[PDB]
Design a protein around this ligand. Structure first.
Ligand SMILES: *Cc1cc2c(nc3c(=O)[nH]c(=O)nc-3n2C[C@H](O)[C@H](O)[C@H](O)COP(=O)(O)OP(=O)(O)OC[C@H]2O[C@@H](n3cnc4c(N)ncnc43)[C@H](O)[C@@H]2O)c(*)c1C
Length: 499
């Protein structure tokens, strides 16, 4: 290891390098660990953490890590569901891109250059600073890094209108295994295809994205309402949501969320209730929204007083529960296990109720979310990016169980969510069991940790066709061309073919 440090110190003439002895190391490590499952002192720790300010800091780290057999994990926002950006089973270093967060918005060309350590929140602020009529389709969690979110797709309220973030990328700059800086034209269309939704950690290190900005009106409308599950109107609305939320006007995206809570009846007897919440952004005015809901979802009974008009960028305040705050908050804590599925056929009302009934074992700390697809998603080819789940997909269902990290509670929580996943098997898509890469899940399979490349590819196709369906085979080809020695690897990285 000492040679590796001398290599770095010689190539990075300097705070860029943080060692175990440096007192800021643990602060910089824990700073962007966002699933506390992996913050334990027993979790594996990086030998060093690099916080580059320049692309040559990354170039030096790649050279030295290759020369001395260190594994790199790239970290942008640190939101990886399985912590793959900051844990490894081998000796590793973290390249943490937090300092490469510069953003250049150009209104006349409707485009922005964005360094890959910028957060979603930072990007939205920088857009609003220059124009209330421009946006970019991405998630709504403002702490998420642009590097990983675009890297695996990037879904949100504008997806039904404009597609995934990965569908709205014009150019990019990447470092490959040979230390070269490439952009779209010099890297080729195949690698430019692979990094937009295929998990860039398999192929190199993305340094920046060139984004295509999209039009939005000056005023949009939001709501976040609760409804009573025992009312027939609520049950019809969920029935109708399953059949219609992917088919309504592309300006409207309605999410659903379900959870249980502890309550009491009128007599004071303890009772568990299911709470149903529906939250939405309509890219339009409130009167048009209300006419639309009466036409398509009258059973929700949406009230004018539940709707709120604002500028597009303020919806991320509302949807993150900043409901006085300035946009500047976008410039600024638990352990969880999550899983997810794609649904191609409406789940019958009785099975949906049995699925909700599993929440009675996990009161207050488990959530089922429903995200609608269709719209623009149906018009985009399944091989336009590595994300393949377009036409034929009605919605994504997302399961989550959370807890506070304090010791067998963890195993009981993970066990519960697996059985719910196993219960859903017959009613969700299959062959492959479609999975959204940005909801990473190691349970669906991991790589060999050395056998032949044939066996590596056969094993990796278990998880690989779940994330990518048929696009997995093109991904293996790109990996074979651009990283034949398999330097950039992790528990779920595309393997190359060898001779
Ligand atoms: C925690 C969290 C995640 C969310 C949230 N909301 C989302 C939403 O509304 N829509 C979505 O589509 N996804 C949402 N997600 C999930 C995130 O999209 C994914 O979890 C992202 O992968 C997270 O990105 P990032 O914050 O950058 O996480 P990292 O752990 O740093 O990276 C993930 C993954 O990608 C590799 N990688 C990152 N950056 C690079 C670069 N520049 N080059 C190469 N490889 C890179 C990492 O190595 C890792 O493997 C809401 C919340 C609260």
């Amino acid at each position: 290891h000492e040679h590796f440090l001398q290599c770095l110190t010689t190539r990075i003439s300097e705070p860029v390098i943080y060692t175990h002895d440096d007192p800021s190391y643990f602060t910089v490590l824990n700073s962007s660990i966002n699933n506390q499952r992996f913050s334990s002192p027993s979790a594996p720790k990086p030998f060093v953490i690099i916080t580059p300010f320049h692309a040559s800091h990354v170039q030096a780290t790649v050279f030295c890590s290759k020369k001395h057999g260190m594994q790199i994990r790239t970290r942008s926002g640190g939101h990886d569901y399985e912590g793959l950006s900051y844990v490894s089973s081998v000796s590793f270093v973290i390249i943490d891109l937090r300092n490469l967060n510069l953003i250049n918005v150009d209104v006349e060309s409707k485009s922005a250059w964005v360094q890959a350590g910028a957060t979603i929140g930072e990007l939205y602020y920088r857009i609003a600073e220059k124009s209330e009529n421009l946006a970019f389709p991405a998630g709504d969690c403002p702490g998420v890094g642009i590097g990983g979110q675009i890297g695996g797709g990037g879904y949100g309220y504008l997806a039904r209108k404009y597609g995934l973030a990965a569908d709205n990328v014009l150019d990019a700059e990447v470092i490959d295994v040979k230390g070269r800086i490439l952009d779209r034209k010099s890297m080729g269309e195949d690698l430019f295809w692979a990094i937009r939704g295929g998990g860039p950690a398999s192929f190199g290190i993305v340094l920046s994205w060139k984004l295509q900005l999209v039009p939005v009106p000056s005023i949009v409308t939001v709501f976040d309402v609760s409804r009573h599950m025992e009312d027939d109107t609520t049950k019809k609305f969920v029935h109708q949501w399953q059949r219609r939320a992917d088919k309504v006007d592309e300006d409207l995206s309605i999410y659903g969320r379900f959870q249980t809570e502890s309550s009491v009846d009128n007599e004071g007897n303890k009772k568990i209730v299911v709470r149903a919440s529906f939250r939405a952004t309509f890219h339009g005015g409130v009167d048009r929204l209300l006419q639309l809901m009466q036409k398509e979802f009258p059973e929700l009974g949406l009230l004018r007083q539940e709707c709120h008009e604002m500028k597009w960028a303020e919806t991320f305040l509302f949807h993150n529960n900043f409901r006085e705050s300035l946009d500047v908050l976008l410039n600024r804590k638990s352990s969880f296990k999550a899983k997810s599925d794609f649904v191609k056929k409406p789940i019958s009302d009785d099975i949906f109720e049995e699925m909700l009934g599993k929440l009675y074992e996990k009161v207050g700390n488990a959530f089922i979310d429903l995200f609608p697809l269709g719209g623009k998603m149906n018009e985009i080819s399944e091989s336009a990016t590595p994300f393949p789940y377009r036409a034929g997909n009605l919605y994504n269902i997302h399961y989550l169980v959370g807890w506070e990290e304090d010791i067998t509670t963890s195993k009981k929580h993970v066990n519960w969510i697996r059985k719910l996943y196993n219960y859903m098997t017959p009613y969700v898509s299959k062959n492959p069991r479609a999975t959204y890469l940005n909801f990473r899940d190691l349970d669906i399979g991991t790589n060999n940790k050395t056998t032949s490349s044939y066996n590596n590819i056969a094993r990796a196709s278990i998880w690989g066709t779940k994330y990518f369906k048929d696009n997995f085979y093109k991904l293996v080809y790109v990996k074979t061309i651009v990283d034949p020695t398999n330097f950039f690897r992790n528990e779920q990285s595309i393997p190359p073919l060898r001779r």
